[PDB]
């Protein structure tokens, strides 16, 4: 029964990197005792990410080990720290070390590195890993001292070669009782073994299991090109996120606030941009503490920017527009905004936000800052879809890939603050990180690589984690791919691609309340129901689009109305077919008019078929009235599109058999009445101005 107080973990760290700090938390979770070598020093160990090196680790260990050269009572484990997490206790570790019968147990690995020719000198192992890895080892302090004291090489000579040569000395191997952890009982090196490692869950703890060997490793080493797979595992192992605990290092449940540089990017035609700009004024962060930079690459959006710039300029403490005439690429524009923050010591946080990011959570900026990370993005998804502003995994050549937990995250079955290889569209970056760790100008530019990926790789290459919070609902992602801007009002056509935003803009704000009851729907005449349907903006834009087309009806035009046996009852009008809006209006019918009708006429069921959908214009100088008639419809929908009094004078609809008149219609409100038999009706004369009406003959 070895005493855990006789175990000492020694690692090397020249800076307190996120990886190093991640290592310590996993150590502190299990009450390990950790000595860190090298914390102030310059790394002279070479480019371990690109080649051989790391001898400086040994040189430092050798010096440290002179204290313990005679301490047979002490067990020491050496591990890297940037790319290591601990998954089990000192008790289970010492139990396993004893069971190995070794005096110094090195980790094992699939590759004979860095001299592939030496493989033949290694003992033949069966199904186990055959070669030594210096990223982790454990043994008596005396034995370890007898190995490392032999170090006499350059700081950038390779440490693993050095240990390999001593391991392959057969007399030394036998005399000192050196061994390798062939079956990853203690040490799990990820390189060459990704398909052997899976997460093993418990109530308040997560581990890894090697499925090749059915073991539960103590130490997870993301050596070589497996740092990002280790990032993934470190989100869980050992207490990153547990089924019963939730995340462990998150802010969980939520006086001058830091000064923020808010940069808005508009790099494609984007729907609902006026709405986005108006939202900037509502973000719950003191505007004297925010300075706004907006890059617009779209001539399409210049009027939209101009309309709201007076308000933005009055709102924030400083504003700057970079417009299409500067001919900046998105890469150059994002480098510029970020560098404007970098070069201002007063810029404490940098907040990048693309025009397709809809932030429903007004406290987003505060929430992200309070998480206190170098880089953190709020999770944003396409409504009801799996597409989102991050990636959970990378392909072998650093392209897109789907992590095994991606759906769990997007669906918020697992919520927390995740270490992911790619984020986009919104993120908050610490000013000091820009100054001290990513000082270059070419963050997004410099290669043919697309900027959004260049950005993420810049941070990954420095070992800066890219964090992603799905801890709260933050907002959504607008669809922008096939946005048709060849309309007077393109957002009218957005009904299929952005239905949630389309409804917020164009459906009446009180529709849903009226659909749910609450005494809003009225019945002005027998079986004629009256409810709010269209917002004023929808009315205005639809009329506008109609006049912009301009081809109103005239003589010899025929509608589906029935009067006086067989006569011709026409209106001056434009059908949806003509302006290319029929599919759109039919969707509004299926989605919003169908369910209201079924609720007002219990027992009736509808798919909201309608062949005749047209806007009617009334004027005293062309066609001011519409004589008594019936409609070819089961029911008729009649929506007012402008204001009685303001835009026209004169009455509206009259139902003759009920001697009931709808005078004073309401803009955006719709009448619902039967089309046949009972509700013979006429449109009263418009006496001044112009009357606009939207009508569909449903279920003909």
Ligand X SMILES: *[C@@H]1O[C@H](CO)[C@@H](O[C@@H]2O[C@H](CO)[C@@H](O)[C@H](O)[C@H]2NC(C)=O)[C@H](O)[C@H]1NC(C)=O
Which residues contact ligand UGA (rule: CB under 6 A)?
Answer: 11-14, 38, 43, 45, 48-49, 52-54, 57, 80-83, 113-114, 134-135, 158-160, 223-224
Q: Give the residue ranges of the annotated binding site for Mn(2+).
A: 80, 83, 221
Q: What angle, rounded to 10 degrees, do the helices at 499-506 and 273-280 form?
A: 80
List the Cα angle 560/561/567 in 5-degree steps. Answer: 110
Count the neighbouring beta carbons within 10 Å of the beta carbon of residue 530: 21
Largest CA distance in the chain: 116
Asked whether the beta carbons of 515 and 503 are under 8 A apart, the reply is no
- 485 contacts ligand NAG (rule: CB under 6 A): no
Specify the stretch interacting with its own copies by CB under 8 A; choose among 126-134, 184-192, 536-544, 623-631. Answer: 623-631
Task: Compute the least distance from the CB of residue 226 to ligand NAG, in Å.
Answer: 28
Distance CA 545, CA 563 (A): 31
631 touches, from Fe ion, ligand X, ligand UGA, none (C-beta below 5 to 8 Å by class):
Fe ion
- The reply to whether 31 sits near ligand NAG by the rule CB under 6 A is yes
- Shorter beta-carbon distance to Mn ion: residue 463 or 580: 463
Cβ-based nearer residue to its own copies, 118 or 660: 660
The answer to the question of residue 527 lying near its own copies (CB under 8 A) is: yes
Dihedral sign of CA atoms 14, 16, 20, 24 in order: positive
- State the binding site for 2-oxoglutarate: 561, 618, 638, 691
Taking CB within 5 to 8 Å according to partner kind, which of ligand NAG, Fe ion, ligand X, none is near residue 31? ligand NAG
- Window 195-224: residues binding Mn ion (CB under 5 A): 223
Tell me how far, at minimum, the Cβ of 113 lies from Mn ion, in Å. Answer: 12
Between 536-549 and 499-506, two packed helices, what is the crossing angle to 10 degrees? 90
Query: For residues 11-30, which are near ligand NAG according to CB under 6 A?
Result: 30
Contacts of 459 (CB under 8 A, 6+ apart): 374, 375, 438, 465, 466
The binder of its own copies chosen from 412, 619, 629, 643 (CB under 8 A): 629
- What token pair was written down for 267? 């790099």
Q: What is the DSSP letter of 158?
A: B
Which residues have CB under 8 Å from 582's CB, separation 6+?
575, 576, 613
Residue from 19, 430, 683, 694 in contact with ligand AKG (CB under 6 A): 683
- Distance in Å, CB of 79 to Mn ion, minimum: 8
For residue 573, the partner it binds in Fe ion, ligand UGA, ligand X, none, with Cβ less than 5 to 8 A by kind, is Fe ion
* Residue 574 · residue 550 · CB < 8 Å: no
Cα separation values, 163 from 10, 113, 160, 239, 258, Å: 17, 11, 5, 33, 49
533 binds ligand AKG (CB under 6 A): no
Beta carbon of residue 369, minimum distance to ligand AKG (angstroms, whole number) = 55
Q: Does 509 bind ligand X (CB under 6 A)?
A: yes
Task: Indicate the residue among 82 and 140 with the shorter CB distance to Mn ion.
Answer: 82
Residue selected from 631, 650, 655, 693 as contacting Fe ion according to rule CB under 5 A: 631
Residue 204 interacting with ligand NAG (CB under 6 A) = no
Rg (CA), the chain: 35
Residue whose CB is less far from ligand UGA, 398 or 682: 398
Could you tell me if 194 and 211 are in contact, meaning their C-beta atoms sit under 8 angstroms apart?
no
Q: Verify cis geometry, omega within 30 degrees of 0, for the bond prior to 238.
A: yes
Binding-site residues from annotation: 12-14, 80-83, 221, 224-227, 561, 618, 629, 631, 638, 681, 691
- Paired residues of 322 in beta bridges: 295
Neighbours of 367 (CB within 10 A): 19
Contacting Mn ion (CB under 5 A), which of 18, 83, 109, 298? Answer: 83
The first and second tokens of residue 517, run together, are: 């009851």
Q: Is 508 in the site for ligand AKG (CB under 6 A)?
A: no
Q: Which does 695 bind (CB under 5 to 8 A by kind): ligand AKG, ligand X, its own copies, none?
A: ligand AKG
CA atoms within 13 A on the CB side of 226: 19
Lookup: tokens for 689: 């101005």
For the bound state, the minimum distance from the C-beta of residue 357 to its own copies, rounded and expressed in Å, comes to 41
Give me the least distance between CB of 526 and ligand AKG, in Å please.
Answer: 16
Residue with Cβ nearer ligand UGA (134 or 210): 134
Cα 82 to Cα 20, 173, 209: the distances in Å are 5, 29, 21
Which positions lie near ligand AKG, rule CB under 6 A? 561, 626, 631, 636, 638, 652-653, 681, 683, 693, 695
């Amino acid at each position: 029964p070895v005493n855990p107080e006789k175990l000492l973990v020694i690692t090397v760290a020249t800076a307190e990197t996120e990886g190093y700090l991640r290592f310590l938390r996993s150590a502190e979770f299990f009450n390990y005792t950790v000595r860190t070598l090298g914390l102030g020093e310059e790394w002279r160990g070479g480019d371990v990410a690109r080649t051989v090196g790391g001898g400086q680790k040994v040189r430092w260990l050798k010096k440290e080990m002179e204290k313990y050269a005679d301490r047979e009572d002490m067990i020491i484990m050496f591990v890297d720290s940037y790319d290591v997490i601990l998954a089990g206790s000192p008790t289970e570790l010492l139990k396993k070390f004893v069971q190995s019968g070794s005096r110094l147990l090195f980790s094992a690995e699939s590759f004979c590195w860095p001299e592939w020719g030496l493989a033949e000198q290694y003992p033949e192992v069966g199904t186990g890993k055959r070669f030594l890895n210096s990223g982790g080892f454990i043994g008596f302090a005396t034995t370890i001292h007898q190995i490392v004291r032999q170090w006499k090489y350059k700081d950038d000579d390779d440490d693993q070669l050095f240990y390999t040569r001593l391991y392959l000395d057969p007399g030394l191997r036998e005399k000192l009782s050196l061994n390798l952890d062939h079956k990853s009982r203690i040490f799990q090196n990820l390189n060459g073994a990704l398909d052997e490692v899976v997460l093993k869950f418990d109530r308040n703890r997560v581990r890894i299991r090697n499925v090749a060997y059915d073991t539960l490793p103590i130490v997870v080493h993301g050596n070589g090109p497996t740092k990002l797979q280790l990032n993934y595992l470190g989100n869980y192992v050992p207490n990153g996120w547990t089924p019963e605990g939730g995340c462990g290092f998150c802010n969980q449940d939520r006086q001058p606030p830091p000064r923020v540089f808010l940069a808005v990017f508009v790099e494609q035609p984007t729907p609902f941009l006026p709405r986005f700009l108006q939202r900037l004024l509502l973000l719950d962060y003191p505007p004297d503490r925010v300075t706004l930079f907006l890059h617009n690459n779209e001539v399409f959006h210049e009027p939209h920017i101009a309309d709201s710039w007076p308000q933005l300029q009055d709102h924030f403490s400083a504003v700057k527009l970079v417009g299409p005439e500067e001919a900046l690429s998105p890469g150059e524009a994002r480098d510029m905004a970020m560098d404007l923050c970098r070069q201002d010591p007063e810029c404490e946080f940098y907040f990048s936000l693309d025009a397709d990011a809809v932030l429903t959570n007004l406290q987003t900026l505060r929430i992200l800052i309070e998480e206190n990370r170098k880089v953190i993005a709020p999770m944003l998804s396409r409504h009801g879809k799996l597409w989102s502003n991050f990636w959970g995994a990378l392909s072998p050549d650093e392209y897109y890939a789907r992590s095994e937990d991606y759906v769990e995250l997007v669906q918020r079955k697992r919520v927390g603050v995740w270490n992911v290889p790619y984020i986009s569209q919104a993120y908050v970056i610490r000013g000091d990180t820009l100054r001290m760790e990513l000082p270059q100008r070419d963050v997004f530019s410099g290669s043919d690589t697309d900027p959004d990926m260049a950005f993420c790789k810049s941070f990954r290459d420095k070992g800066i984690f890219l964090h992603l919070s799905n801890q709260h609902e933050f907002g959504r992602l607008l669809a922008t791919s096939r946005y048709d801007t060849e309309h007077l009002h393109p957002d009218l056509w957005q009904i299929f691609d952005n239905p949630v935003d389309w409804k917020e803009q164009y459906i009446h704000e009180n529709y849903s309340r009226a659909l749910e009851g609450e005494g809003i729907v009225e019945q002005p005449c027998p079986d004629v129901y009256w409810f709010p349907l269209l917002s004023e903006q929808m009315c205005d834009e639809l009329v506008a689009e109609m006049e912009h087309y301009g081809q109103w009806s005239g003589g010899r035009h025929e509608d589906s109305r029935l009067a006086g046996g067989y006569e011709n009852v026409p209106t001056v009008d434009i059908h949806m077919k003509q302006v290319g809006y029929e599919d759109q209006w039919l969707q509004l019918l299926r989605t919003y008019v169908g369910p209201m009708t079924e609720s007002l006429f219990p027992g009736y069921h509808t798919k909201a078929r309608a062949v005749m959908n047209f806007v009617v214009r009334y004027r005293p100088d062309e066609q001011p009235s519409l004589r008594p008639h019936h409609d070819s419809s089961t029911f008729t929908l009649n929506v007012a599109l402008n204001h009685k009094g303001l835009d026209y004078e004169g009455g509206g609809c009259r139902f003759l058999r009920y001697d009931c008149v709808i005078s004073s219609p309401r803009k955006g409100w719709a009448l619902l009445h039967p089309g046949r038999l009972t509700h013979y009706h006429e449109g009263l004369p418009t006496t001044w101005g112009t009357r606009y009406i939207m009508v569909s003959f449903v279920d003909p």
